């Protein structure tokens, strides 16, 4: 008879995470109906290197890590094995030789409306270039000189985060494109998420 784990509620909703405080939902012990995302779908740019989209339902990995992101139109391509840009260098990073799928669908509506939204800020100005799979839920004034400012901003001492100033009247390569990354795992553990 089977069932279906709440995969879609991660995919559809009004308020999606952020660029740096990105949600990462673990999904296990379910029959995730992958047929709904490729066989009958209206999602642009469903290129999800790592496993062939066909017969995805007949191969199953250990645990699901569902992600969620909001990116400008042009900056969607930064999801790649490292590459360049302000994603995967200070934002969430894609590990090298990673195996999992990536989807990016336009969201000009459904909570992307007039006015630079209060949330949806960058994650910028980190002293290091991050490590894969680690999550940045911390905020503090950056270091950009000899003396460390003691908590009061001024010369240098940049605040890391700046808001996305988008709206439903923007261009073509700058409108929001909500991004979902389904991360598999390859390890010595049995596969949990399985089923037709």
């Amino acid at each position, epitope marked *: 008879i089977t069932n279906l784990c709440p995969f879609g509620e991660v995919f559809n909703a009004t308020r999606f995470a952020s660029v740096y405080a990105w949600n990462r939902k673990r999904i296990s012990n379910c029959v995730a109906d992958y047929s709904v995302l490729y066989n009958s779908a209206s999602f642009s740019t469903f290129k999800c290197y790592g496993v062939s989209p066909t017969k995805l339902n007949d191969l199953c990995f250990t645990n699901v890590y569902a992600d969620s992101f909001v990116i400008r139109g042009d900056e969607v391509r930064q999801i790649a094995p490292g590459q360049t840009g302000k994603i995967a260098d200070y934002n969430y990073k894609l590990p090298d030789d990673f195996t999992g799928c990536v989807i990016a669908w336009n969201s000009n509506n459904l909570d992307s409306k007039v006015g630079g939204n209060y949330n949806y800020l960058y994650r910028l100005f980190r002293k290091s270039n991050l490590k894969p799979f680690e999550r940045d839920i911390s905020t503090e004034i950056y270091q950009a*000189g*000899s003396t460390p400012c003691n908590g009061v901003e001024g010369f*240098n001492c*940049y605040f890391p985060l700046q808001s996305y100033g988008f709206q439903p009247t923007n261009g073509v390569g700058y409108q929001p494109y909500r991004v979902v990354v389904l991360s598999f795992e390859l390890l010595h553990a049995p596969a949990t998420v399985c089923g037709p």
Partner: antibody
Framework: MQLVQSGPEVKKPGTSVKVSCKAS????????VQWVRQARGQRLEWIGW????????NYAQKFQERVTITRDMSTSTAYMELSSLRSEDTAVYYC????????????????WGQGTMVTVSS | EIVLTQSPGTLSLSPGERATLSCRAS???????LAWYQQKPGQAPRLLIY???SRATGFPDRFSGSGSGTDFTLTISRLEPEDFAVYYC?????????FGQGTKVEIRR
């Protein structure tokens, strides 16, 4: 380590103006840029700073109005429009930037330019 | 915020100087958010001491001075006639980042 500026612009008494500082030789992705005023045989007045890694700016008491910066991330440049040009603005505007490369960088504003020459005459 | 008015005006003597200049302040500013530029006739300025606690990367030697908050003093000790031009103090930290009056130098004749 070079920074070239546009040629001497000529305007009319109160239309507009825009100046360009091309930044080269240092990482312009994460740095800061400032703009000043000068004259002949006169003092220097700070105008407006640009955190250029991510745009956030303020202005001096006489420059809150009639002035706003322009980012233009690509081509590694910087712009600011001055509006309602006044006669006593025959100034060399200059620009400065810290030598930043890698995420942490020098405090003193060490990378400068040469400036333009604007004369709001007939 | 702007009462700096560097005490010296125009001073004139050949090399053989122990001269010093002062950058008085309105309120004692935190050090290392300071600067001391050096304008030149018909060119762009430079940077000499970046915060009264060091010296800049590379510049001619034989002078480096530091002071307190309301008195960010500085000194010059027998520099060559090449370095005879208008100086300009500076402040960081609090907007507006204000500069100073500037100090002028001269030579006995």
């Amino acid at each position: 380590m070079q920074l070239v500026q546009s040629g001497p612009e000529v305007k009319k008494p109160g239309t507009s103006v825009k100046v360009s500082c091309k930044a080269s030789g240092f990482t312009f992705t994460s740095s800061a840029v400032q703009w000043v005023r000068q004259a002949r045989g006169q003092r220097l007045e700070w105008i407006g700073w640009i955190v250029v890694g991510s745009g956030n700016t303020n202005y001096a008491q006489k420059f809150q109005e009639r002035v706003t910066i322009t980012r233009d991330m690509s081509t590694s440049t910087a712009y600011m429009e001055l509006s309602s040009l006044r006669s006593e603005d025959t100034a060399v505007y200059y620009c400065a930037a810290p030598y930043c490369s890698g995420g942490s960088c020098f405090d003193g504003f060490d990378i400068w330019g040469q400036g333009t020459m604007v004369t709001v005459s007939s | 915020e702007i009462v700096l008015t560097q005490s010296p005006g125009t001073l004139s003597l050949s090399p053989g100087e122990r001269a010093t200049l002062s950058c008085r302040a309105s309120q004692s500013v935190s050090s290392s958010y300071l600067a001391w530029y050096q304008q030149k006739p018909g060119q762009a300025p430079r940077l000499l001491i970046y915060g009264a606690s060091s010296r800049a990367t590379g510049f001619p030697d034989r002078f480096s001075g530091s002071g307190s908050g309301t008195d960010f003093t500085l000194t010059i000790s027998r520099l060559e006639p090449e370095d005879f031009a208008v100086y300009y103090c500076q402040q960081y930290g609090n907007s507006p980042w204000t500069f100073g009056q500037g100090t002028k130098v001269e030579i006995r004749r």
